[PDB]
Amino acid sequence: STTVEKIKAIEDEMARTQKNKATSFHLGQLKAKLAKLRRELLTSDVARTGVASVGFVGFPSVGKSTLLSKLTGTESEAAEYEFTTLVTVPGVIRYKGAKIQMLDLPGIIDGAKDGRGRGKQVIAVARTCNLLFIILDVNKPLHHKQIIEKELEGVGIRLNKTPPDILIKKKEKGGISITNTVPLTHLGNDEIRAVMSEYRINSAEIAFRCDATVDDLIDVLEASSRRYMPAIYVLNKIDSLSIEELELLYRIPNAVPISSGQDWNLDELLQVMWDRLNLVRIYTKPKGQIPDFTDPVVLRSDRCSVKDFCNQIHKSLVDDFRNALVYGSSVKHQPQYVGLSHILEDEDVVTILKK
């Protein structure tokens, strides 16, 4: 593919291009083109009833395969060793009433088969996860770490961040105008008109309410495509270290030191994983039978409305929605008739009526 060599043709010269005012405009010209290139790599919402999906990313290693075999609880052969495989799936664990389905993602770490038919598949499925475990060897973590984050940023994954508070609304006359709330320590108006140029944005107003960088602004123009979602750095083979700096490794955010061989800190890893997945459980109830409490349906913290729950059950349910009865803290006096917009809460019991 010529697209990948173009992308390399950009990256190499950008790397050999030093940073100053004279190169500032050229590099601003060039990041936007690089974004234009990567979006068509990304070219190919989620109503997967399912339970949940969490990805494992890391270079092939014995500790990593031991960890996944431990967590999934199943063992066999030859499939965990092929690197041409896009992703692997057999393995679901029940945790506090909710299932979780895990993935191996060797296809993310690529570059020889990156531009192939199954490359888009592995990228897309990796991009729909609830969390990613970034597995490292604590003795040689760096060289892997930069490559992994580089690829994720290349494929539109934003790790441990939030969408920047940058507002853009298009005009017709007046060209490009800028509103500033906090002083800009990195972005010059030359860069502003640079990046605005490629997107054919003739006239608009852009409001800054935080010290955004060039990548933040590009993400803002790419809001519909990018995804912001948590990731946790897992550090295995910690047996060779010592406790005093193990506590210092506990001063790294999202860092979970474990030793898969002797199974240290698997509890802490599970607790943190659930904590950041922030998954709420809803128990359905029919008229006659009492709730099962055996197979609760799980939602996210930001998508726990009645309308979301109905869609999660089926698309046609929302159209056939009469009203809802809710047991739990979501309502004042349980039960109380509620609408679609009503927000649910963890461990509630919900009954829907057909219309």
Place this chain on the structure above:
Amino acid sequence: REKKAEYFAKLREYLEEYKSLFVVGVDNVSSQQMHEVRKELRGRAVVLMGKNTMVRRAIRGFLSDLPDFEKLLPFVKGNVGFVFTNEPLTEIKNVIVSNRVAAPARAGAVAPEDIWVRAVNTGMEPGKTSFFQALGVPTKIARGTIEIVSDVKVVDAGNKVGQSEASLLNLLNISPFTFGLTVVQVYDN
């Protein structure tokens, strides 16, 4: 013609005075491991696995310095091979038959003779012990070692080497596909 005339020159030079004459048929061969016997024998007997010139291998001897050259003319067949040295040949056949280095068949090629498989210990960790279903040989693992329970026939006369039941015969370390160097005729001068 001109490009191949040097093969005539190279045979003509060798067919001037060198007293030994010896032909060998080499149809099946493992050339790689059979040219370290071409390097252990440096300068002793220059080997010649020549071309279809068997017709005028004898005709071209019009000089007739040794008129027996018309000796293999009714033998235009096989892979005849020429070696020659000024020493008693009775010692070379000791070293050129011992090199019976062998390999598996061509994933199912011919079988030299019926082979009986006994229960002999090997001494390896459990590998293809979970892959003894094609032939159905009972194999038990003890102290981390593979032992054959029952002696089950593998090959037969009339049928040849297989591909599912015979992939492990060189895990039993036999020599089905060797066809080492063989004497076909000897004549001096």
Place this chain on the structure above:
Amino acid sequence: KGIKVTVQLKIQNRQAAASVVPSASSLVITALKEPPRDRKKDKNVKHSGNIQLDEIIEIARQMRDKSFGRTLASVTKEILGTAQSVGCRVDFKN
């Protein structure tokens, strides 16, 4: 000790540990060429050199995995230099 992945003639059976070299391709360069051969070649690339810095290389064929016994050093001399992209070492053929 070698920038290219150096193969060794090493078998591990019951306490056998010895860093011995089988005289592979990239280590005779490490010896014959200057000590700046394992060093100073991280970002540099040196495609230069034609000095006849040695002529008695035939002292290596005995542990160079004997292949051309009937020739003394023509394999060592007139083959290297072309594939050996560092230098030429011979004004005989290049």
Place this chain on the structure above:
RNA sequence: UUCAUCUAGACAGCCGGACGGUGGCCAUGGAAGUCGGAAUCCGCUAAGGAGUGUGUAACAACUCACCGGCCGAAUGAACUA
């Protein structure tokens, strides 16, 4: 019609091998020919490419292109009407 190959055994077809130097110099998670980048010479032989490809995360595992054994007489390309 003009070139070529061919009993000093052609085209096919089967069957046998298909080696070392040297994992050639960088790219390095890795290139033994095979994700890629500039290079392209030699010895056993009649013959084996610092390589056609299937393929390994790399190696091996298979194939060709090269020659050989059988077969024993014509065959290959371009063009004209």
